[PDB]
Design an enzyme around this catalytic site. Structure first.
Site, PDB file in Angstrom:
ATOM      1  N   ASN A 136      21.164  13.109 -53.742  1.00  0.00           N
ATOM      2  CA  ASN A 136      22.270  12.199 -53.457  1.00  0.00           C
ATOM      3  C   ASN A 136      21.746  10.972 -52.705  1.00  0.00           C
ATOM      4  O   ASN A 136      20.579  10.937 -52.295  1.00  0.00           O
ATOM      5  CB  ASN A 136      23.353  12.962 -52.651  1.00  0.00           C
ATOM      6  N   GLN A 168      23.029   4.629 -49.163  1.00  0.00           N
ATOM      7  CA  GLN A 168      23.576   3.447 -49.775  1.00  0.00           C
ATOM      8  C   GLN A 168      24.485   2.694 -48.804  1.00  0.00           C
ATOM      9  O   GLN A 168      24.732   1.491 -48.976  1.00  0.00           O
ATOM     10  CB  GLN A 168      24.349   3.836 -51.016  1.00  0.00           C
ATOM     11  N   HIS A 178      30.944   9.548 -59.331  1.00  0.00           N
ATOM     12  CA  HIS A 178      29.779   9.348 -58.476  1.00  0.00           C
ATOM     13  C   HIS A 178      28.509   9.630 -59.252  1.00  0.00           C
ATOM     14  O   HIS A 178      28.418  10.648 -59.903  1.00  0.00           O
ATOM     15  CB  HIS A 178      29.907  10.268 -57.260  1.00  0.00           C
ATOM     16  N   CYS A 190      25.943   3.542 -55.924  1.00  0.00           N
ATOM     17  CA  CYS A 190      25.454   4.853 -56.341  1.00  0.00           C
ATOM     18  C   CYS A 190      24.911   4.805 -57.736  1.00  0.00           C
ATOM     19  O   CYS A 190      23.781   5.202 -57.909  1.00  0.00           O
ATOM     20  CB  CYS A 190      26.507   5.944 -56.207  1.00  0.00           C
TER      21      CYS A 190
END
EC number: 3.4.22.2
Length: 212
Positions: free
Chosen positions: A175, A19, A159, A25
């Site tokens: 992730n 990102q 997150h 996120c």
């Protein structure tokens, strides 16, 4: 449900992305689930545009943060374009969906998993990739480099990531910090400890898209 699930092996997860320095996120999380469910239903794996959600979701704050559930409803209400046609820029601009042509995909709705319940979440993951939140602020998470992660960490989630499988002692998470983090971009978080928050508050807020 089986003892192990990994959507990667079933061809429903696209490559790990980065990102960069933009708090998007929430958008990356949402896209992983959309890429997931479209594959499960139509047999075809495609990448979708995080940038499009970043620029168009008016409830969210662009690079300042947002809500994966707002994104998912946008995909249900309107649709989303391919990543190739609407590529990631790493900054909020204006919504350009209009000038991209027809949406590539559309979902039918969104559903939330019952929170603070390990079983409910494993059941969902067994059906499809799910968007989840966790506390990533602590150094241990940020420096994670492999193994089953047990913390230390509290429950102050900040997150959003996506859960793409599990095994006897962990839950498998994709992730969006690129491949130089964790296990080529993934993390295995410990489960079964009996804490209703989940390790790092993992069981706090999980949503998944519905497509018939």
């Amino acid at each position: 449900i089986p003892e192990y699930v990994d959507w990667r092996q079933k061809g429903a997860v696209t490559p790990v992305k980065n990102q960069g320095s933009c708090g998007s996120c929430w958008a990356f999380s949402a896209v992983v689930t959309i890429e997931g469910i479209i594959k499960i239903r139509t047999g075809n794996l495609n990448e979708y545009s995080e940038q499009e959600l970043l620029d168009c979701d008016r409830r969210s704050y662009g690079c300042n943060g947002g809500y994966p559930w707002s994104a998912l409803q946008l995909v249900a209400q309107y649709g989303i374009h391919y990543r190739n046609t609407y590529p990631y820029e790493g900054v909020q601009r204006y919504c350009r969906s209009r000038e991209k042509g027809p949406y590539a995909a559309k979902t039918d709705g969104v559903r939330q998993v019952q929170p603070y319940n390990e079983g409910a979440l494993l059941y969902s993951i067994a059906n499809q990739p799910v968007s989840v939140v966790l506390e990533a602020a602590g150094k241990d998470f940020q420096l994670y480099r492999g193994g089953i992660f047990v913390g230390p960490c509290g429950n102050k989630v900040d997150h959003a990531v996506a859960a793409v499988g599990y095994g006897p002692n962990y839950i498998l998470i994709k992730n969006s910090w690129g491949t130089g983090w964790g296990e080529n971009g993934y993390i295995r978080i410990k489960r079964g400890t009996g804490n209703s928050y989940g390790v790092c508050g993992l069981y706090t807020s999980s949503f998944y898209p519905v497509k018939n």
